[PDB]
């Protein structure tokens, strides 16, 4: 596992190229918020160099670069800020779980945002990478639309105590906002599970089972992405680096408690999904029971009747077919007899 | 010494003796001609095509001073890829692969590489391999292999094997895409068998590729002085390539698994459909056959004379009960 950190060579690729491992390439933008106790300034731009002199800023600053399909801007920012090339690859790489790394001059945290669309019942994941330096917080996103609006409002309108603190409190605020978004996503999953379970009992079709299976896969991915988040917060408040002050640790502990709660909720979800899954099978087996019950009712009533009809329909030229009351109608009576009793017998089992 | 495999059709020996000044290549079917080449200070590449000929591989084994245990390992075809470090020679077991998009089968041919001072020994099973680019590079002096020792030759052979693995991955990706398209819409009985075969192939590929990654990792991370330091980074790069393969296989497996999942979702619905069909068909014919038999006895007193033209009336009542049953099956979503 552990070894000298280095760039990873890839086949069919130039030795030094960094590739964006994602799908979103629509737009790119850089929003910078440089705030202090007295005054703040925010601006949205596209030219990278216009935000480069913010590296050596006494007041804390927050640089949100939305759109990392532009590998040039990411490479320029990482090269000027002194970020390691492997960290740049991790920023551009998206098919990886949330993680935390500690370096001499910065801490690097990979986290996953989440959105859920009830239509198409889709759960989309977007990776956000945070880099905390001595006096600046870089945040690489993928596409327009984040869950850090409350933090932006707090910076703009001087709510909370975020203005009176350094960049560590800003990092805590961003992580807490992401955890709150996770809680909202869990509420949406509550709603989806309730809506699916109120239907799986009385509408047991194949598309319902496909929905249940994709929901199970969604919760599996949720567990696989939230457990590393719990580990990240644990290492963040139990192995604090010099960059993070001694103060603000209890806030990270609070975020850790929140992710413990989230993990517990996901654990309950993992069993509720199976609870829904069993119900469809039970209902289909019940319908199968009903149809095969009427089938066996018909078979039981009619097979002996056909048998005895064949017995009295076979010719031997010596057959007692002439009896009291000419013999024949009694057979029909017997038919009805060996019919009605069967029905009565089935009334013992309450079939049909 | 027993050959566990099944390929024994042909056997031949190939020799590539290359240096900076010049190279000599010869294909010989006799064991003796290749013995003296251990003494040559130039890099040497021997290739034993057939191991079913236990005599030649045994003679090479006791002539090169390699323990009979690695001989048994070479003849053990059903062996995982692995690496063994010894004082005068390093032993490596790898698996090639061949995929044909007509039978959807994945056959593995084990290959053994023994690296001794300034020479490399290959042990294969069949005519034809994936080290042709290395042969062309040696012959036409395209690369820097001619200016290095046998360790770079081993690196080149392993790299060629990894490239063949990449080609196999491309073929499997095409198969996975086609099968996914055929399964998500328009399923049939052939598709599930194809999915099972693909899952078996992916399981085998994964089960082979992880030991290969372990082999490369242990090979570059800490190695005896058999391979020079100059070739240490190159092996490292190959390891990275293997990682790609491994990860891809994992991803592929997931996709295939998902497919099987959906096919296992609708089995009970299929049961319900089948006996809906069977119950409908048996419902409307068992009583009809019963009453046909009722009118089919041989009783003399049977009221069978005229009575509104005789037979047709019963047909009528048949249809009556029939349509009644049809009505009873028009509702309840059976039909």
């Amino acid at each position, epitope marked *: 596992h552990m070894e000298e950190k280095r760039l990873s060579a890839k*086949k*069919g*690729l130039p030795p030094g*190229t960094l*590739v964006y*491992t994602g799908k979103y390439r629509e737009d790119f933008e850089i929003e910078v918020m440089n705030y202090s106790i007295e005054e703040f300034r925010e601006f949205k731009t596209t030219d990278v160099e216009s935000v480069l002199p913010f590296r050596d800023s006494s007041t804390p600053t927050w640089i949100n670069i939305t759109g990392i*399909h532009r590998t040039d801007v990411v490479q320029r920012v990482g090269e000027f800020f002194g970020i390691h090339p492997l960290v740049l690859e991790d920023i551009l790489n998206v098919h990886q779980r949330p993680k935390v790394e500690f370096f001499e001059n910065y801490v690097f945290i990979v986290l996953k945002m989440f959105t859920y669309d009830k239509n198409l019942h889709e759960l989309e994941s977007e990776q956000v990478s945070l880099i905390l330096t001595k006096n600046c917080v870089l945040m690489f996103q993928e596409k327009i639309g984040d869950v850090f609006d409350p933090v932006r409002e707090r910076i703009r309108y001087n709510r909370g105590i975020i203005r009176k603190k350094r960049a560590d409190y800003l990092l805590y605020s961003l992580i807490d906002a992401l955890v709150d978004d996770y809680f909202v996503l869990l509420e949406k999953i509550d709603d989806e599970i309730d809506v699916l379970e109120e239907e799986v009992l009385e509408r047991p079709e194949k598309e319902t089972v496909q929905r249940t299976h994709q929901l199970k896969r969604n919760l599996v991915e949720l567990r696989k992405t939230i457990w590393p988040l719990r580990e990240v917060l644990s290492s963040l408040y139990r192995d604090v680096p010099p960059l993070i002050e001694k103060e603000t640790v209890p806030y990270f502990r609070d975020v850790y408690d929140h992710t413990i709660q989230i993990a517990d909720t996901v654990e309950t979800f993992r069993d509720i999904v199976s609870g829904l899954l069993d119900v469809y099978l039970s209902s289909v087996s019940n319908k199968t029971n009903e149809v095969m019950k009427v089938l066996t009712i018909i078979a039981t009533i009619f097979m002996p009747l056909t048998f005895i009809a064949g017995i009295y329909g076979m010719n031997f030229e010596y057959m007692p077919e002439l009896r009291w009351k000419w013999g024949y109608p009694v057979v029909l009576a017997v038919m009805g007899v060996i019919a009605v009793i069967m029905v009565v017998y089935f009334k013992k089992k309450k079939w049909l | 010494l027993v050959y566990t495999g099944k390929y024994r059709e042909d056997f031949e020996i190939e020799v590539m003796n290359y240096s900076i000044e010049e190279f000599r290549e010869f294909k010989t079917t006799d064991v003796e001609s290749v013995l003296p080449f251990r003494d040559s200070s130039t890099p040497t590449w021997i290739n034993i095509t057939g191991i079913h000929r236990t005599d030649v591989v045994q003679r090479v084994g006791e002539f090169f001073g390699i323990h009979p245990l690695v001989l048994e390992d070479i003849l053990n075809v059903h062996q995982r890829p692995k690496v063994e470090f010894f004082e005068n020679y390093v032993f490596i077991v790898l698996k090639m692969f061949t995929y044909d998009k007509n039978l959807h089968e994945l056959e593995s041919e084990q290959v053994s590489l023994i690296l001794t001072k300034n020479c490399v020994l290959m042990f294969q099973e069949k005519i034809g391999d994936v080290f042709d680019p290395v042969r062309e590079r040696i012959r036409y002096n395209r690369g820097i292999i001619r200016k290095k020792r046998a360790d770079y030759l081993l690196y080149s052979l392993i790299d060629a094997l990894v490239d063949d693995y990449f080609v196999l*991955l*491309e073929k499997i990706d095409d198969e996975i895409d086609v099968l996914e398209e055929e399964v998500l819409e328009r399923p049939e009985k052939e598709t599930v068998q194809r999915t099972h075969q693909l899952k078996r192939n992916l399981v085998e590929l994964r089960k082979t590729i992880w030991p290969l990654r372990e082999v490369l990792s242990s090979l570059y991370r800490d190695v005896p002085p058999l391979i020079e330091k100059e070739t240490v980074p190159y092996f490292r790069d190959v390891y990275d390539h293997t990682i790609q393969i491994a990860d891809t296989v994992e991803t592929f497996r997931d996709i295939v698994s998902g497919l099987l999942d959906v096919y296992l979702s609708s089995v009970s619905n299929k049961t319900n459909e089948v006996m809906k069909v069977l119950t409908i068909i048996a419902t409307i014919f068992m009583p009809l056959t019963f009453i046909a038999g009722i009118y089919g006895m041989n009783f003399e007193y049977m009221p069978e004379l005229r009575w509104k033209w005789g037979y047709p009336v019963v047909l009528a009542v048949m249809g009556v009960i029939a349509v009644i049953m049809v009505v009873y099956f028009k509702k309840k979503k059976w039909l």
Partner: antibody, heavy 128, light 107 residues
Framework: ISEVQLVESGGGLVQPGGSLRLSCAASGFNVSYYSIHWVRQAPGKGLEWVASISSSSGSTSYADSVKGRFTISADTSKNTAYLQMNSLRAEDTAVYYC???????????????????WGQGTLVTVSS | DIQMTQSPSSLSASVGDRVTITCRASQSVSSAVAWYQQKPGKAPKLLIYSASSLYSGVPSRFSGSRSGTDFTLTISSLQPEDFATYYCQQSSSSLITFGQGTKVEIK
């Protein structure tokens, strides 16, 4: 600052067996962070990729039709790409385009490059 | 080399119709196929990459599909500004090759 723009120059009439250097000036981006391709299109025929350069490492790729003859290079100091064409045949008369490509990811083992922005293209005529 | 055989070559259709152009790779390419359009006398313009993804800025009417080694570009509804030559490109290997083109003309 400024939009992406690729400008070709250096094309012109040249005798068979001669040599000329096509220069592709890039404005709006750094050539070191992307790959630059040269694509050939004969008069009244389809496109034909002729060369590719990765300035961050100097790795080159050539088509089989021009292997050993064309030489592609790039300099970051001038932020420019160059295609030197010698031993030039009469079949090479065509319009040349200088395009910029970016890599995208499909699977962990497979990558692909797509040409975002193309240049105007310069016409090179080999005759007489 | 990898040969991309692209058919048809002289497709003709009217405005508002549905157009499908197919192209087949000689050997396996792992979905690394792009689709470009070129009007006469101008540089090609990228439309589709990864054989399914839609490039930024192009109209949504263009669509791309892949089945094994068969790549199809579909225009759901033609426009007066959609009559140009269309080219496949495979980028699986470092030697990247184009198709022969498919001209789309009014009928």
């Amino acid at each position: 600052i400024s939009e992406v723009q690729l400008v070709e120059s250096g094309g012109g009439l040249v005798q068979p067996g001669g040599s000329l250097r096509l220069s592709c000036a890039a404005s709006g981006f750094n050539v070191s962070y992307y790959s630059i391709h040269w694509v050939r299109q004969a008069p009244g025929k389809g496109l034909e990729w002729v060369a590719s350069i990765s300035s961050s490492s100097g790795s080159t790729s050539y088509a089989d039709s021009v292997k050993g003859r064309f030489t592609i290079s790039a300099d970051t100091s001038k932020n420019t790409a160059y295609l030197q064409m010698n031993s030039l045949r009469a079949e090479d008369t065509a319009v040349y385009y200088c395009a910029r490509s970016y890599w995208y990811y499909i699977w962990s083992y497979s990558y692909g490059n797509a040409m975002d922005y193309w240049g105007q293209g310069t016409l090179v005529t080999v005759s007489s | 080399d990898i040969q991309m055989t692209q058919s048809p070559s002289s497709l003709s259709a009217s405005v508002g119709d549905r157009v499908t152009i197919t192209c087949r790779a000689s050997q396996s390419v792992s979905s690394a196929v792009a689709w470009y359009q070129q009007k006469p006398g101008k540089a090609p313009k990228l439309l589709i990459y990864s054989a399914s993804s839609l490039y930024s800025g192009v109209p949504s009417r263009f669509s791309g599909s892949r089945s094994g080694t068969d790549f199809t570009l579909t225009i759901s509804s033609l426009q007066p500004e959609d009559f140009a030559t269309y080219y496949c490109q495979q980028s699986s290997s470092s030697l990247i090759t184009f198709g022969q083109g498919t001209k789309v003309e009014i009928k």
